[PDB]
Amino acid sequence: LMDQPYSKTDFLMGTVVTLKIYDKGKEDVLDKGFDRIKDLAAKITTSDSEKTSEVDKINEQAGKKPVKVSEDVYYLIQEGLKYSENSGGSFDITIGPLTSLWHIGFSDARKPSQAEIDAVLPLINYKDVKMNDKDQTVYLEKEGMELDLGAIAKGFITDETLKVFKENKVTTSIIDLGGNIYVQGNNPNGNKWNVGIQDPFSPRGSVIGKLPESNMSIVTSGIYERYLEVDGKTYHHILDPKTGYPFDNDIAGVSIVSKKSIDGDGLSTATFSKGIKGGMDYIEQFEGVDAIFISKEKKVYETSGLKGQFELTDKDFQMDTL
Ligand SMILES: Nc1ncnc2c1ncn2[C@@H]1O[C@H](COP(=O)(O)OP(=O)(O)O)[C@@H](O)[C@H]1O
Ligand SMILES: [Mg+2]
Ligand SMILES: [Mg+2]
Question: Could you say which of 50, 245, 261, 267 would form a disulfide bridge with 217 (CB–CB 3.0 to 4.6 Å)?
């Protein structure tokens, strides 16, 4: 193991992405990782006017005909439908018509009018996604429907990147896709990795504290990471598919700790829909999954798996308990 890792940085999917590998001799696995990330993102993205992705193709054939898709996309949509069901539809990968409408995080983001929202809500229904395992085809049942895999793409890509790493016998590494961290192995000095917990009020990278972790995903969401501002008001990018407006409750930010990064992303949105007290309860129903919640009043909560493990460093915040 090396003290200083092999490191590469890029800007993809609208975020800074960095990979670090500490195993001597494996510098070329960084390119294998970024290659994989780029291949997955090209299949998944809807927001490239120059290329038609598999997701784009599914969307343009809504109500028309099923679409042959690759194993990567078929798999990701299957998992998205499970998270959709498991969430009670507060998370729904068919939110596409609604997220296209606000298009938060792009220079043309806007607050649509209620009448425009009302027109797209009847299109949001994960149950209208028709999978065929035999054919490996995906069919949206009604015209107008749009898939949006945004809320699970970085988790899936992280896990797929780790698979690339393990295939090349990488043992110690850090994968950072902006709002997703995976830490593999331990620090070369033998300690667990000290994972920063994001300060939801400050730019990405600022932290309120550290959580020691090894071989774990940490996924972070917050009310200010991608948002729109108009008339002195803020609209973040995690939308209520039943309302058309961003979830409004006491959560400022949440970091979810799990074995798989996709479960991190997956569980993120149903957690936002439930608030602090309800989101902790939801997370307590999932074995091997925990969370640190940060409320709008700057108080910090741990689920049972994590109780007493977060090390708070920012005095503006305070540990609290239900
Ligand atoms: N309720 C929802 N269910 C499913 N997907 C959503 C929902 N709201 C927004 N999305 C899509 O998923 C993305 C949110 O992903 P998330 O992981 O929470 O943010 P980040 O990209 O900062 O990690 C949005 O940008 C949008 O494309
Ligand atoms: Mg997510
Ligand atoms: Mg994410």
Answer: 261
Neighbours of ion ligand 2 (CB under 5 A): 151, 265, 268
Residue 81's domain comprises 1-322
Domain count, the chain: 1
Q: How far is ligand 1, taken at its centre, from the CA of residue 63, in Å?
A: 24
Ligand 1: list residues with CB < 6 Å. 91-93, 95, 99, 148, 150-151, 154, 179, 221, 225-226, 237-239, 241, 265, 268-269
Cα angle 250, 181, 199 (rounded to 5 degrees) comes to: 35
Cα of 54 vs centre of ligand 3, distance in Å, is 20
Resolution, angstroms, 1 dp: 2.0
